[PDB]
Structure 1
């Protein structure tokens, strides 16, 4: 009599490819990263590089001025709550702790301060979020710090090597 077929479960990929990814490519089309007005069209590679670098510098200075005053970008009005609308934090959140404070100071003049705090509060530096951060930031200092951590603490050897 009345048949009941099973429903299809599609997320944000099937409908996207069925709607947007079902057209052709324009012939004389400039890259859509910029604008479309005739006076601001990229005529060569130099103009495109300059516009891209200007956009990157604008984004960087915007993020910098947002991180400088975090108390002006917190009153949300949206509902789905986009996770990419919250600035990152770089100041430590633990004072009386040792390993947790060192990790918060390293991950979240920062690496040296974290190393000094770990040496003062007697905190064993692990092989994750410590040696790699010291090698990426600072390379005789990183080697000296690794040697000091290996001489003062004997945990994992393969990861340290």
Structure 2
């Protein structure tokens, strides 16, 4: 007697949910699932639909603004396993010394103004800076065009500006590479 042990089947963590969803269809008598399924809150017209979705997004944005403005009220973690997407985010750099660390922190946080000021201070001090770091600074400046990223709170023509820190840093760049161009 020999037993035939079957081969194990493996799937992603959402395979069962997708298989279950494959058996259901769109409810023809129901509004889109985003809206609350209630006659009073069911959108009537397309304008009502757009306004309701915009109001929901505004509420979410206000909640996120509160979360980021007062992160100390949401630092208590009681979720097991840990849920990174439900933790407060950080947008302001914390390194204060004039070195590559603070400049890289500002670049990865896209704080264009402080990154440029810190880069100017670093160049004045003459301390070391990586070529890749200056390339990343140029990438951020060129993609954003000296536009500070729009946080929650404190078209026609050419959006580029003739005078900008990107061109100045490119001129003052010690060494250029293919990725820079």
TM-score scaled to structure 1, two decimals? 0.71
Consecutive unaligned residues of structure 2, counting only runs of 5 or more, are: 108-145
Measured at CA, do residues 144 and 6 of structure 1 come closer, stay the same or move farther in structure 2, by a change above 3 Å?
same
State the Cα deviation string for residues 61-109 of structure 1 (Å, max 9, x = none). Answer: 1111111111100111111111111122122121114232123224996
Secondary structure at the residue paired with 1:114? Answer: coil
Greater length-normalized contact order (CA 8 Å, ≥ 6 residues apart): 2
Shift of 1:141: 5.4
The answer to which of 39-48 and 94-103 deviates more is 94-103
Q: Is the 8 A contact 1:105 1:111 kept in 2?
A: no
Number of residues of Structure 1 aligned to a counterpart in Structure 2: 138
Measured at CA, do residues 45 and 113 of structure 1 come closer, stay the same or move farther in structure 2, by a change above 3 Å?
closer
State the Cα deviation string for residues 103-146 of structure 1 (Å, max 9, x = none). Answer: 3224996899999xxxxxxxxxxxxxxxxxxxxxxx56585312
Measured at CA, do residues 69 and 85 of structure 1 come closer, stay the same or move farther in structure 2, by a change above 3 Å?
same
Q: Is the 8 A contact 2:36 2:42 kept in 1?
A: yes
Q: Is the 8 A contact 1:67 1:87 kept in 2?
A: yes
Shift of 1:14: 2.5
Q: Is the 8 A contact 1:89 1:108 kept in 2?
A: no
Measured at CA, do residues 99 and 4 of structure 1 come closer, stay the same or move farther in structure 2, by a change above 3 Å?
same
State the Cα deviation string for residues 7-63 of structure 1 (Å, max 9, x = none). Answer: 101122431222222123322221010111111111111111111111111111111
Secondary structure at the residue paired with 2:67? Answer: helix
What is the aligned-residue RMSD (CA, Å)? 4.2
Consecutive unaligned residues of structure 1, counting only runs of 5 or more, are: 116-138
